[PDB]
């Protein structure tokens, strides 16, 4: 998805969630619920086939 | 921000390979490539605190 593609590039720069909030013009407990999604959706992998 | 060899894994991560394509990828072992990306993710989740 390329909005947490997005996200997932600025995280990778070091940026902190208030960066990132500020860069994007939302609430930093935006960004928080965001990042929490975008990292669980990395830490899962495909099962099947 | 991220290492070059971390930022290639994160690439693969947002490819959506599995743990096991990863390993074959980069002539590891899967439990090895397991723990690269635990590492990552924890990095990820984390920011600094200071100025």
Redesign the interface.
């Known amino acids: 998805t390329d909005q947490e593609?997005t996200l997932?590039g600025l995280?990778?720069?070091?940026?902190?969630?208030k960066q990132i909030a500020d860069r994007m013009f939302l609430a930093e407990k935006t960004v928080k619920n965001y990042v929490s999604r975008l990292?669980a959706k990395?830490?899962m992998?495909?099962r099947t086939q």
């Open positions: 593609r997932l995280l990778s720069e070091g940026l902190t969630n990292l990395l830490g992998e495909r």
